[PDB]
Design a protein around this ligand. Structure first.
Ligand SMILES: *Cc1c(COP(=O)(O)O)cnc(C)c1O
Ligand SMILES: *Cc1c(COP(=O)(O)O)cnc(C)c1O
Lengths: 390, 390
């Protein structure tokens, strides 16, 4: 609603992120309703580090997937219980593993045998039983030319499962809880997702057949993409097919197994708009440039809507040609005071950007819900920048 | 010195930035000695926002070029006097212009006629005389196909000088102090720099001939690049030729004019190394991956040195394939504990990166000088992340 947005800029200084909390909830509940109850959704915190948004998901029953001790802290700030937190990452420091073990979370998802040994040492030191899952890099490709999967820095190749399981079994203070497969972000190929998830459920079966172990948790990953430029995923097909496959596993060998589908982008991308005001308008060498008050330092990832036709380039306030929101775009003439709205800015936005580049204040974040507006992140200050320097 | 670096990792937690302050000073003094004294060097703060490093340049007599009210604050923290601060930028908010006018800095470098009018309004409100310079986008190309310059969001086309000067003259509380030309960063073409600078000095002459005004300040910009992959600029030729050209102007129409050469990258790039420790080593689909504890969140821009041959990919600790320091690089086998050093990391490093992406602590920065080591930026904390959220 342009009228709503315009009215908001009178009370909140641009540039800012505006989140539609009503949409976030409806969008999530629609996904939840179509998915087998044995599958629990986990919010990927790296997609958006705002604890106020994370709290909403916590209240709805989602778990949270963190990738650092820092995110673990944010997750606790958001109220996620330890039993609903999993720790992923290819380069966890021992200090991070230490805090994770001390926190007694659902599980640390190990990505190397050496990591498993570190966890065991820490479990012994802390006199605790550390829960671990293993991230597997499938030896299968889900357009791909070569068979056998892709070389990745993440997890451990499926072919190394024997070595991995031998290690986990030898670590007396560690308990194996399951597996995790995540093939990448912004996946817009419906069948590739279904195939990967079914493959992961099958890996669970292989583990029982080869080791007699029943995975307590099978994390199917996800990487559900959202169209930015592109067709949307057939969420109905994914949820229906995977739910049926999971139920079959549930009705046989995995009656008490928790299945997880992780999501960052799909849950939040379309729920926010980045609102920026046009500051200046100029012509240069036959072209027209419109300079707005927001940019790369707030939304590096950067559809757009304009609030009051020509070829124009929309640039941010930074001193670099890279701060371009739109090059040679055709839109009605924009003038100082007009608002440029960047759509689908709810994921990989603020925290994905070089917030301190050129010293501009970080943007305000607003959450709209139940007919009200809540400030969920204050405007940054110069002191926020020098904090680590003084 | 590998021995030095190794010893430092015992006292300082990796990943961290290490700056050779002895080099910074020697490097600067060599540049200074070869340059006409009528030319003053200005540090571009956006290249590195550490006030402790900026202070060194302030002590040596350099001015500072800021691009936001935030950087203006940092400049004052570093001790730069108002008369040695200039404010650049294509999208300055009125609030930024207000603080700039209230600070009485050497000059605000305007990039539009509308900006000039805003400055005048503020000068009137604050009962002050605002000093302004104008950023000109030359109608000349300095390999380029088309003549006449390039369309840019920065400054005002040279062809609009009449309109610009008519505006400045009509603003009674504003004093015109000069011009500024900056063609871009990482310029490794020696002659293009010399040509641009001479062209800028000539613009000063044109302004006197057409308006009878003598520029108090002519900012030649710079954009001196440094080789990362490439041949180094012939600094000797640039300093000699431009110095002679400036002296000629000095001996005729511009006897008391301050000439400025700005630099960010050239002054700091080669003075720092980003030190990261190898955490894990693994093989995946026939390839070898080495995971280090530093990455994109600290040095997004990313030569490298290794401290104890194969084809290997060096990846950071982030949960994204984009966190790659080196792909398919040939280097002696790296193992956990080894150190990977990223060279020429002194400019566009930390503040140019998405520091809060995935919640890892910002890195420590160390300054080596006169045989000692000084901590110039403490390790980040989870509280630094939630500050704006609570
Ligand atoms: C980033 C990440 C996610 C979330 O991905 P989206 O594409 O945002 O849904 C899930 N799992 C892991 C292991 C991740 O690193
Ligand atoms: C970034 C910038 C500089 C510094 O550029 P370097 O390439 O780092 O020397 C100088 N002047 C302006 C106007 C800038 O925006």
């Amino acid at each position: 609603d342009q009228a709503e947005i315009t009215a908001l800029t009178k009370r909140f200084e641009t540039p800012f992120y505006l989140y539609d909390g009503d949409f976030i909830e409806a969008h999530y509940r629609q996904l939840r309703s179509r998915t087998n109850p044995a599958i629990q959704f986990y919010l990927s915190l790296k997609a958006n580090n705002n604890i106020h948004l994370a709290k909403l998901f916590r209240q709805w029953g989602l778990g949270v997937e963190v990738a650092s001790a820092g995110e673990l802290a944010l997750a606790r700030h958001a109220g996620f219980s330890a039993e609903n937190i999993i720790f992923s990452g290819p380069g966890k420091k021992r200090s991070e593993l230490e805090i994770a073990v001390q926190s007694g979370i659902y599980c640390i998802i190990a990505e190397s045998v050496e990591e498993l040994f570190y966890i065991e040492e820490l479990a012994e030191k802390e006199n605790k039983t550390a829960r671990v899952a293993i991230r597997i890099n499938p030896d299968k490709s889900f357009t791909a030319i070569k068979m056998g999967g892709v070389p990745r820095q993440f997890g451990m190749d499926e072919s190394m499962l024997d070595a991995v399981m031998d290690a986990v079994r030898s670590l007396q203070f560690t308990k194996f809880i399951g597996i995790h497969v995540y093939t990448g972000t912004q996946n817009l190929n419906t069948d590739s997702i279904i195939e990967s998830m079914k493959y992961t459920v099958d890996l669970g079966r292989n583990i029982y057949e080869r080791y007699g172990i029943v995975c307590e948790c099978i994390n199917l990953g996800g990487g559900f993409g959202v169209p930015y430029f592109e067709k949307a995923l057939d969420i109905g097909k994914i949820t229906r097919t995977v739910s049926d496959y999971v139920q079959e596993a549930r009705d046989t060998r995995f009656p008490q197994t928790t299945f997880i589908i992780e999501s960052g982008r799909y849950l939040l991308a379309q729920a926010a708009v980045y609102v920026t005001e046009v500051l200046y308008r100029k012509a240069s060498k036959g072209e027209v440039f419109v300079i707005v008050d927001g940019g790369m330092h707030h939304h590096a990832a950067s559809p757009m809507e304009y609030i009051p036709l020509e070829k124009v380039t929309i640039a941010g306030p930074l001193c670099t040609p890279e701060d371009c929101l739109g090059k040679d775009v055709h839109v009605p003439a924009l003038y100082p005071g007009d608002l440029v709205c960047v759509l689908n800015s709810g994921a990989y936005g603020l925290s994905f950007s070089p917030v301190h580049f050129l010293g501009h204040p970080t943007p305000i974040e607003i959450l709209k819900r139940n007919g009200s507006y809540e400030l969920i992140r204050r405007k940054g200050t110069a002191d926020d920048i020098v904090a680590t320097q003084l």
